Amino acid sequence: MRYPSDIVDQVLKAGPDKGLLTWEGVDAACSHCSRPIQNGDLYSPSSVGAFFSDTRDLASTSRSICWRCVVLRKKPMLYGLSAAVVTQDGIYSISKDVNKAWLFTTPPPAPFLVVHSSSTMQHLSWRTPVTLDNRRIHVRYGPNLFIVRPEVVRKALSIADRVNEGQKKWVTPVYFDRKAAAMGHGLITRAGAEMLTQEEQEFFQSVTPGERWALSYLMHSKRPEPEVGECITEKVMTSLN
RNA sequence: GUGAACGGUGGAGCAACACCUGAAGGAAGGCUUGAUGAGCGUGUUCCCCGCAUACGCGGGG
Numbered sequence: 001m002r003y004p005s006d007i008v009d010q011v012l013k014a015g016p017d018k019g020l021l022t023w024e025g026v027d028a029a030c031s032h033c034s035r036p037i038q039n040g041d042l043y044s045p046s047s048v049g050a051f052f053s054d055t056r057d058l059a060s061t062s063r064s065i066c067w068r069c070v071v072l073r074k075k076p077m078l079y080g081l082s083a084a085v086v087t088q089d090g091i092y093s094i095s096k097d098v099n100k101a102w103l104f105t106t107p108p109p110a111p112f113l114v115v116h117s118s119s120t121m122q123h124l125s126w127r128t129p130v131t132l133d134n135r136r137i138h139v140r141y142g143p144n145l146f147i148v149r150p151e152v153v154r155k156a157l158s159i160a161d162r163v164n165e166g167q168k169k170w171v172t173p174v175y176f177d178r179k180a181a182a183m184g185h186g187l188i189t190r191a192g193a194e195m196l197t198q199e200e201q202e203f204f205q206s207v208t209p210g211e212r213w214a215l216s217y218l219m220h221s222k223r224p225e226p227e228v229g230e231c232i233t234e235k236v237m238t239s240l241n
Numbered sequence: 242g243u244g245a246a247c248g249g250u251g252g253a254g255c256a257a258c259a260c261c262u263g264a265a266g267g268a269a270g271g272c273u274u275g276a277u278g279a280g281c282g283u284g285u286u287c288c289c290c291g292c293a294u295a296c297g298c299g300g301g302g
């Protein structure tokens with residue numbers, strides 16, 4: 001519940017691969033997940049391929065992967081956590097917009113860990129911190145480390161439901177990009193320029209990029225009700241074995 | 242040791258093909274280069290204006 005690699009044996013039960021070396025000597029942190037490798041725990045020397053391009057998100061330059069993050073670099077872990085929230089009892093999916101509606105509005109009370117892929121297969125699990133508090137959520141989205149406050153998401157959603165109550169067409173006040181890629185991601189629309197007051201506009205610039213990315217999955221004409229995502233920890237474990 | 246440090250928006254692509262500014266329409270009706278200025282009458286002291294300042298000068302008809 002402290003390091004992102006803890007879910008290897010806390011969220012989902014797993015063990016070392018038994019071809020891993022035993023650490024002898026002084027303390028050194030794992031290159032992935034920033035977990036200190038003590039004396040006696042199993043570790044692997046660093047054998048990343050040339051296709052690994054996340055050297056900028058490595059926690060340390062010790063060139064040693066802890067066994068939990070050896071499990072975390074496995075391909076079934078890589079496509080199993082392409083969109084997943086890992087609570088203290090299981091791994092659930094956030095692929096649907098109703099699942100992100102559940103995650104960023106009334107979050108689960110566990111100290112979870114949120115990963116989401118901005119591409120096909122990405123190293124997501126180890127390079128994000130564990131969110132200890134529901135109010136402050138660390139979301140990994142591709143090369144982006146995002147922080148989402150569900151209270152600010154609730155305030156923006158209440159603002160949007162106020163300015164779009166009674167109207168026939170649900171027009172968004174501020175445009176949000178799902179990929180977080182367009183220039184106008186966070187830019188105020190003309191309808192939102194005419195239908196929001198000044199302090200609401202400064203609020204919509206003042207939100208964090210993670211809240212913008214979350215609102216991108218929950219600001220559209222059909223509004224997703226918070227529905228808990230389907231539990232996928234059985235699918236990941238079966239794939240892992 | 243600025244959640245830092247590192248990171249090319251890139252490569253290629255014909256605005257081009259054909260198209261009559263053209264048809265019709267009177268610069269005319271009337272008007273002396275001919276004159277005009279070229280030569281033809283008065284016969285002796287009479288008014289008025291200035292410079293002067295009256296010794297005289299210029300001058301109107």
Ligand SMILES: [Zn+2]
Nearest residue numbers: 030032033069
């Ligand atoms: Zn690790």
